[PDB]
Amino acid sequence: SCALPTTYRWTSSAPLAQPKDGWVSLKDFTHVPYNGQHLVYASYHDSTKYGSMAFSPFKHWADMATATQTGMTQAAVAPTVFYFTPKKLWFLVSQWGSAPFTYRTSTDPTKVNGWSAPQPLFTGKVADSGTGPIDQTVIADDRKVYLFFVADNGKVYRTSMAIGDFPANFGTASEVILSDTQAKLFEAVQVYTVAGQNQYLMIVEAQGTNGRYFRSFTANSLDGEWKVQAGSESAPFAGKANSGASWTNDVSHGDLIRSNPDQTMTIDPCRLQLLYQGRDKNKVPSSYDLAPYRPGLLTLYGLGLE
Numbered sequence: 001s002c003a004l005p006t007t008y009r010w011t012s013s014a015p016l017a018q019p020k021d022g023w024v025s026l027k028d029f030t031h032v033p034y035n036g037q038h039l040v041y042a043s044y045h046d047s048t049k050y051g052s053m054a055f056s057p058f059k060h061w062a063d064m065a066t067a068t069q070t071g072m073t074q075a076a077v078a079p080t081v082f083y084f085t086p087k088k089l090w091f092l093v094s095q096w097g098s099a100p101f102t103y104r105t106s107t108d109p110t111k112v113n114g115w116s117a118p119q120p121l122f123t124g125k126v127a128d129s130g131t132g133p134i135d136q137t138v139i140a141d142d143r144k145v146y147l148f149f150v151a152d153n154g155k156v157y158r159t160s161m162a163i164g165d166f167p168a169n170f171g172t173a174s175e176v177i178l179s180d181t182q183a184k185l186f187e188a189v190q191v192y193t194v195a196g197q198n199q200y201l202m203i204v205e206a207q208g209t210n211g212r213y214f215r216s217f218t219a220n221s222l223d224g225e226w227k228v229q230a231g232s233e234s235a236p237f238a239g240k241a242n243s244g245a246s247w248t249n250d251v252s253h254g255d256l257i258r259s260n261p262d263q264t265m266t267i268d269p270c271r272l273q274l275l276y277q278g279r280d281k282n283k284v285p286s287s288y289d290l291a292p293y294r295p296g297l298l299t300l301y302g303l304g305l306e
């Protein structure tokens, strides 16, 4: 195995795709390996609203730029895709619409518009938030399925249910598991099982002075306490300080590359890669919702002598 490093260093791709005509951005990526291919769902923004989409399955990252971009006719903003092995079904979890978070199911997750009708997955609210719950992820161990989310408010939230109950509405309850400034625990929480390392990894997007960046935390169990791993802007999990990305100062909402598509959200720490959203650092400010986000890929450096 390969331990997660003390100090992260990455190289970056160029932007991996441009939005198709009529869209301004591609955002909030979720990726699974599927039949030897990359399967990516994402949010998009057009001139006026958010929606969701998938890319046609593609073998190589080089392929992403020409993959077909298909909008979902019932939006599934900020999606999470995985296979739930105890039901033999694929899940797509997302925000807004009929409930704060919803789930939908499929036997073939590549059917962009083939998912079941959305059902409530979470019906809670939280305090001191202008957005409410956003940016969920879902992850399980052998005992429970957990929902983690954020709220643009400096807090990370968690709820859970017994594994044998999933899927169902988690309900209204949630607990604060991490609390800091709004900037430090802002958006885009993700949680993973670290293969061969007997631990769990969380990343959370923060607003830095130089751009968006990710902060990492580790825990010994999904119901355990999270402790910071790489939390400063100058020595982050991933950010301008260590991304190797020349084109973007932001390293923002996406997904680590998972080694298998199931509910454990497993990553291979020997092949650590981040599918992120970035934006041209030289494009003058405009509204956030019109920001020209694009996919990018970070790949961790190999070990070296220095």
Ligand SMILES: OC[C@@H]1O[C@H](O)[C@H](O)[C@H]1O
Residues within 6 Å of the ligand: 027, 028, 043, 050, 078, 134, 135, 187, 188, 253
């Ligand atoms: O893309 C819509 C929202 O903005 C941010 O990318 C956030 O993470 C997501 O909820």
Ligand SMILES: [Ca+2]
Residues within 6 Å of the ligand: 028, 029, 030, 078, 079, 080, 135, 136, 137, 188, 189, 190, 254
């Ligand atoms: Ca997400």
